[PDB]
Structure 1
Amino acid sequence: KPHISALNAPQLDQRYKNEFTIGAAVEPYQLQNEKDVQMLKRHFNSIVAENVMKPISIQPEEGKFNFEQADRIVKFAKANGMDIRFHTLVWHSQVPQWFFLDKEGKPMVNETDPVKREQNKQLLLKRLETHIKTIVERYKDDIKYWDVVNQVVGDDGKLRNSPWYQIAGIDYIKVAFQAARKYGGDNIKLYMNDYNTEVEPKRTALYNLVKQLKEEGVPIDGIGHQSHIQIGWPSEAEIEKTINMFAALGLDNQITELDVSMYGWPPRAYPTYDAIPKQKFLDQAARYDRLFKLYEKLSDKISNVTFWGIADNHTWLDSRADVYYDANGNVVVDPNAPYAKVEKGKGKDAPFVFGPDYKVKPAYWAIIDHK
């Protein structure tokens, strides 16, 4: 099956249009790249901002809201009939430092006095409510799907002990959802998003958290499974079990940030795209085959599958593509083998179904067919 230009390959979204939307994460510069634009128009019917809707991009100083970049994505989506997801109202990263300062400018996490700690909690929660309000009041009629909180459960299966949690305890999560619902109404859909959702003890900790929140009347419509995965991990069976366990709580499931890295963890990357052996693309294609068969099997539980980029020329996974060199300067990709140095974030991953030259990969063929 040939490596043809994607720009006129059969449309991915159309393949899946009765099963779930097909989405891409974008940067605003990509809406000014002719190829990226034609890719979005051709293959995708949902869109999300990779970065420009995060807390630090939207409100970098208190009272200073930049919606200009966010607005461009929204405008594009509307003109092209795409669904929109908002990523994300609350996170422990890419979040402005000002939220967590007390009235004297000291970090709130330092405060020892209990009455002052409680005052800081209430102040933080007010600021959270104001951030959410201002965003949802602007976008509630345009944006259907909302990542209300991102990564709030730890890999150890405890709540992530971020400043949100250290300052305000569990109530930051409830307040975020209640605020979104209050200002956005009943027709926006609210998600908790996280990675390694298939993995214990994180998975059951997420499940117990959400079950309790819903029992307490916190409005949560779904779970976002970030799905930053590898060729051989996590298994499809464990993916299935995960999706099924949340759908049994009455939750929608979205595959929100899918990419299938060529590498393991921590990754030992190739230094360039050209160095990645052909067999890796085949192994990837077979993984994508199995994965999409599974998502189809579960399509009544999955409303969207979004890729965390458009094509292999641009992926956040390059920032993790560490390149290991042996004493003779040769590249090392065997996870156990000797090496002398590492160049962090200097290599190349290849996670999508579309190549860096915008031509279709074997993974594309594997998911566009009906086998």
Structure 2
Amino acid sequence: SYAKKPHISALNAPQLDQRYKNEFTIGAAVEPYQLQNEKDVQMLKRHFNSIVAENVMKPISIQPEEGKFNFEQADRIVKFAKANGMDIRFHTLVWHSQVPQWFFLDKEGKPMVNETDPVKREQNKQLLLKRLETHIKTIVERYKDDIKYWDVVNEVVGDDGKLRNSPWYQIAGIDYIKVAFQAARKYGGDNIKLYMNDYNTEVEPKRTALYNLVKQLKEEGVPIDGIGHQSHIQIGWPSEAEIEKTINMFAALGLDNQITGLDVSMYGWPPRAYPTYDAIPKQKFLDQAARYDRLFKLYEKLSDKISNVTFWGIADNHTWLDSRADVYYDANGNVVVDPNAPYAKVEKGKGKDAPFVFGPDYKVKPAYWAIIDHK
């Protein structure tokens, strides 16, 4: 965990996946352009044995208009993974975000959610569910021999512990979830593994709502193999005790657990970010390293219940958390990072987070030494 350990290039550092290879795979979320970047390619080859698409396998990326399938970008990630012996996760077959609006239009082009006639509403449910099945069918028929792990549905439970009231749910009810898993199993066969993915899986009432939902679906024969824990977490939240309780709870149902989008933000919520990487104080990296130390000790403790830990990026020079890195300024134009201190204006998404164990110059951080060691 030491800060005495040097800030060496990650391309010269002990391989992260090999450190954990008997405990769980180590994955990274990627964009196709990173496969054209020499340093990113070297990082993926050196440290990772699992891969996921950050964006190009989402519904709107794959079928942006009905009947128009763009597999070109996804294919490049699959090809790279196969050439390098990496597991692949598919993110994601169903989601209320980055989803093409044509799914939810009726035969006359009007939003299905507005329909008041119950017979027309039922017709729209069957149309939506058929479109859903065709989307999944086309994708799974192409990739079933190459992609082992599938985020079949993403974020289907609300933070209020109710089912998320997305158009999927408004139009089709709970059946859209059942149909999605049944279609994946039907066209993909018994060897692909099917996951329900979500964030804040550690937090009540969402955690028990997710638990009750998967328990009921499995009792009804819906094929669900595991839970994907996005794990978009902070230095001091959620607690390791609550993470452990979450993983055990779902393992008790016979479910695999995967950590699918891990990042450890430097900030709280809503974040008050530093404007640049250079401005983040050294102590934050030490606090982060201690958190990573405890976190991966717990993952190892629970390794018989976790098959994969995937980071939502490669190195600190690229992370979706920067889109959340709001910079607060006081009246004198000085940066404000104290979560309830006075401020005058905010520059949304203009700051810099630092969530990984590899820095933006591809050199290892204190968090790397904290999880590569055996203490």
TM range (shorter): over 0.9
Q: Distance in 2 between matches of 1:322 and 1:89?
A: 30
**Structure 1 residue 314: deviation in Å?**
0.0
Describe the superposition over 1:149-186 as per-residue Cα deviations: whole angstroms up to 9, x where unpaired: 00000000000000000000000000000000000000
Residues of 2 paired with 1:154 and 1:115: CA distance? 28
Q: Aligned pair 1:137/2:141, yes or no?
A: yes
Aligned equivalent of 2:299, options 295, 306, 318: 295
Give 1:42 deviation, angstroms: 0.1
Tell me by how many angstroms 1:32 deviates: 0.2
State the Cα distance separating 1:54 from its structure 2 match.
Answer: 0.1
User: Per-residue displacement from partner, 1:73-121 (whole Å, max 9, x unpaired)?
Assistant: 0000000000000000000000000000000000000000000000000
Distance (Å, rounded) in 1 between the aligned partners of 2:11 and 2:146 = 27
Distance 1:319 1:199 in 2: 23
1: CA distance between counterparts of 2:204 and 2:24? 27
Which residue of structure 2 lines up, in the alignment, with residue 273 of structure 1? 277
Per-residue CA distance 1:268-324 (angstroms, 9 max, x = gap): 000000000000000000000000000000000000000000000000000000000
Partner of 2:313: 309
Q: Which of 231, 234, 250 is the equivalent residue of 1:230?
A: 234
In structure 1, what is the Cα distance between the partners aligned to 2:77 and 2:12? 23
1:343-366 per-position Cα deviation (integer Å, ceiling 9, x unaligned): 000000000000000000000000
SS at match of 2:224: coil
Whole-Å separation in 1 of the counterparts to 2:96 and 2:18: 36
Q: Secondary structure at the match of 1:224?
A: strand
Give me the whole-angstrom Cα distance separating, in 1, the residues matched to 2:101 and 2:347.
Answer: 30
CA distance in 2, matches of 1:31, 1:208: 40
1:205, distance to aligned residue in structure 2 (A): 0.2
Provide the C-alpha distance between the structure 2 equivalents of 1:247 and 1:51, rounded to a whole number of angstroms.
28
Deviation by residue 1:179-228 (Cα, 9 ceiling, x = unmatched): 00000000000000000000000000000000000000000000000000
- Report SS of the residue matched to 1:89: coil
How far is the alpha carbon of 1:20 from its aligned partner?
0.1
Q: CA deviation at 1:68?
A: 0.2
The answer to whether 1:23 aligns with 2:6 is no
Confirm whether residue 353 of structure 1 aligns to residue 357 of structure 2.
yes
**CA–CA separation in structure 2 for the residues paired with 1:113 and 1:334:** 52
Q: What SS class does the counterpart of residue 303 from structure 1 fall into?
A: strand
3-state SS of 2:362 partner = coil
Seq. identity, %: 99
Q: Residue in 2 aligned with 1:244? A: 248
Could you tell me which runs of 5 or more consecutive residues in structure 2 were left unpaired when the two chains were aligned.
none
Extract unaligned runs of 5+ from structure 1.
none
Q: What is the CA RMSD across the aligned residues, in angstroms?
A: 0.2
| Alpha-carbon distance in 2 for matches of 1:188, 1:32 | 29
Cα shift at 1:331: 0.2
| 2-structure distance, mates of 1:149, 1:53 | 13
Partner SS for 2:263: strand
Q: TM-score, normalised by structure 1?
A: 1.00
Match of 1:216 among 210, 214, 220: 220
1:8: how far off?
A: 1.4
CA–CA distance in structure 2, aligned partners of residues 232 and 243 of structure 1 = 18
